[PDB]
Write a protein of this length. Structure first.
Ligand SMILES: C[C@@H]1O[C@@H](OCc2cnnn2CC=O)[C@@H](O)[C@H](O)[C@@H]1O
Ligand SMILES: C[C@@H]1O[C@@H](OCc2cnnn2CC=O)[C@@H](O)[C@H](O)[C@@H]1O
Ligand SMILES: C[C@@H]1O[C@@H](OCc2cnnn2CC=O)[C@@H](O)[C@H](O)[C@@H]1O
Ligand SMILES: C[C@@H]1O[C@@H](O)[C@@H](O)[C@H](O)[C@@H]1O
Ligand SMILES: [Ca+2]
Ligand SMILES: [Ca+2]
Ligand SMILES: [Ca+2]
Ligand SMILES: [Ca+2]
Ligand SMILES: [Ca+2]
Ligand SMILES: [Ca+2]
Ligand SMILES: [Ca+2]
Ligand SMILES: [Ca+2]
Lengths: 114, 114, 114, 114
């Protein structure tokens, strides 16, 4: 099934935050309406915040997360969870190798803000 | 029901990150085995990261998040999500006022690391 | 925080199903736009499916779950999970006593159907 | 990523329930420690319960759900959610066709019981 794709409410601010847990350099691209809106890069085996930004969902509300290591796309897992019918979390995990811990690049999207 | 309390696997390192979305200054305390292990503080209405840290779950694995604003504990909402039977997220939202957006302090715990 | 309340897609069919794990007789009420649409009841300590039904969410889409044992309201926990940006589960747990297993009446709401 | 595989606590009773939303007959296999423990089969486009049972997780705690339609394995989506650090849901969606509604056979695993 398709992973790493979420439909947010239109014209709404959201936060996007990436973590790294691998010996390979992670490249995280965040797409809004099929165009790159944010990009983060870095290497960590200690859960370093390789980037965090505030973006607008735009007219479409389509947000996609892609992860690659030196050009090679990582396998993705994702889900969305809503607490008390108000607070939203869009969660992404990625695997760049064989051990299947899926933490090599972890991406968290949260809304609403303010 | 009790919220913001999580049982992690014993002696496992986890990441903890806090965001702020309120007029008031947020104080986030992270407890391990019923003792304070980390404390974050700051103010933002733009989802700024007020703290991030790597901790150990210890012998018991019991981890608790508490949030205080303007001298009063915030109301908490929480849940744990596990993707592909490997990647764990422990999510916390909090409310300090009357609008019930529950984003005033957002806390994300993730494991395993490395 | 308010629990057991969910905003479903308007005018859409959903499935609601209840399980029982208590020595006390459970009563589950399902409200659609603030009016009782379904009621299930039973007594089992072995996860008996005391009721399953298909309902329409109506013009507003507001769905609420309430649980009571001998006329006393049970404490509720709830969350919504979305898989592959399409498949939805609204989950409810309830506690009628003091052991805090929160499984005394478990309610699962799923959509879309068909 | 692998889907439909869950690690439960050892020697623990759990409930497994399957729903159907497809013109094709759904066959659901539940494996405990890599051996078939339960099999459900049925057809519905109205979310009918095609089977429910209580099983023991055994010494390993490994539980796997498989879905097939007329011999053809369905693509699976899954996640585990824990409420108030006590109540566990293991959730499975499956797709047998081209529309990608992933509800053709829906499987809900819940624990603890009693
Ligand atoms: C330290 C390790 O780093 C990666 O493995 C090592 C690695 C480094 N670049 N690509 N890979 C995958 C193929 O070898 C990662 O997959 C593993 O979970 C650990 O975090
Ligand atoms: C068999 C037990 O049943 C309930 O407890 C016992 C019970 C029966 N009716 N109400 N109560 C709550 C006050 O005692 C329930 O809370 C507990 O988790 C077990 O499933
Ligand atoms: C009524 C429909 O039934 C299936 O489609 C029709 C069908 C019936 N058997 N296999 N397929 C897949 C290829 O045609 C299913 O995938 C779809 O979501 C609807 O529930
Ligand atoms: C700017 C406002 O500050 C406090 O009143 C919060 O309770 C609100 O959610 C909002 O963020
Ligand atoms: Ca890895
Ligand atoms: Ca890793
Ligand atoms: Ca607020
Ligand atoms: Ca706020
Ligand atoms: Ca109880
Ligand atoms: Ca019980
Ligand atoms: Ca389908
Ligand atoms: Ca279907």
């Amino acid at each position: 099934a398709t992973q790493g794709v979420f439909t947010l409410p239109a014209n709404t601010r959201f936060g996007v935050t990436a973590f790294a847990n691998s010996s390979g350099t992670q490249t995280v691209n965040v797409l809004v309406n099929n165009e790159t809106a944010a990009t983060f890069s870095g290497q960590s085996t200690n859960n370093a915040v390789i980037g965090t930004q505030v973006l607008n969902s735009g007219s479409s509300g389509k947000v996609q997360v892609q992860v690659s290591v030196n050009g090679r796309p990582s396998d993705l897992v994702s889900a969305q969870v809503i607490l008390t019918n108000e607070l939203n979390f869009a969660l992404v995990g990625s695997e760049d190798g064989t051990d299947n811990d899926y933490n090599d690049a972890v991406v968290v999207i949260n809304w609403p803000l303010g």
